[PDB]
Design a protein around this ligand. Structure first.
Ligand SMILES: CCCCCCCC(=O)O
Ligand SMILES: [Cl-]
Length: 162
C-alpha cells in the first residue's frame, strides 16, 4: 500500500462513459518514458458492469501501432478499489471524482521491494481543465512520482495521443 486517498461515497455506475487521459504520473520514469512504456495507457471508456465490476477500454502502443485493449477490474469490499488479475496482483483505486467533469485514479503493484504506481487525471472532454489538474497535483504531493506527462486538446483527439 502507498495510496491512501480514496473517494468516500463512490457511485461506480455514475462513472460510466467517455473519458480522456489528460495527465499521467508514475513512481518510476521507465513506466511512462517510452511511447511503448508499460503504463502509458490512454483511457477511452469506463464500463461498470450491473454487478459492480469495472471494465476499462483503452489504447496503447504495442507494435509500431496503437492497439485497443479491454481490461476487467473486479470489485472488492471497498467501493473505490478494484482488482485486475495477472501474474501479479495489481489494484485500481478511484481517488476522487465529480462524475461530470473529472476523475482521478491510480494503479499500484503489491510488493515489491516497495510498490510502483501510476495515476491519471481523466476528464470528460478534450479540454485542459486547470482545476482537475490542481486536484491531481494535490493528490500527487502525497506520492513518490518521478515522471509526469500532460496532453493538449489536439493530441487528446488522436489515437494514442499522437
Ligand atoms: C487501469 C488500466 C490498467 C493499466 C495497465 C494494464 C496492462 C496493459 O493494458 O498493458
Ligand atoms: Cl469495489
Amino acid at each position: 500500500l502507498i495510496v491512501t486517498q480514496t473517494m468516500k461515497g463512490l457511485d461506480i455506475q455514475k462513472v460510466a462513459g467517455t473519458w480522456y487521459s489528460l495527465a499521467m504520473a508514475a513512481s518510476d520514469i521507465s513506466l511512462l518514458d517510452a511511447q511503448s512504456a508499460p503504463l502509458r495507457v490512454y483511457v477511452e471508456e469506463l464500463k461498470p458492469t450491473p454487478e459492480g465490476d469495472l471494465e476499462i477500454l483503452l489504447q496503447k502502443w504495442e507494435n509500431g501501432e496503437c492497439a485497443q485493449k479491454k481490461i476487467i477490474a473486479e470489485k472488492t469490499k471497498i467501493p473505490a478499489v478494484f482488482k485486475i488479475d495477472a501474474l501479479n496482483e495489481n489494484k485500481v483505486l478511484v481517488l476522487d471524482t465529480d462524475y461530470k467533469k473529472y476523475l482521478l485514479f491510480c494503479m499500484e503493484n503489491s510488493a515489491e521491494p516497495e510498490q510502483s504506481l501510476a495515476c491519471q487525471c481523466l476528464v470528460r472532454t478534450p479540454e485542459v481543465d486547470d482545476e482537475a489538474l490542481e486536484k491531481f497535483d494535490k493528490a500527487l504531493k502525497a506520492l513518490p512520482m518521478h515522471i509526469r506527462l500532460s496532453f493538449n486538446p489536439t493530441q487528446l483527439e488522436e489515437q494514442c495521443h499522437i
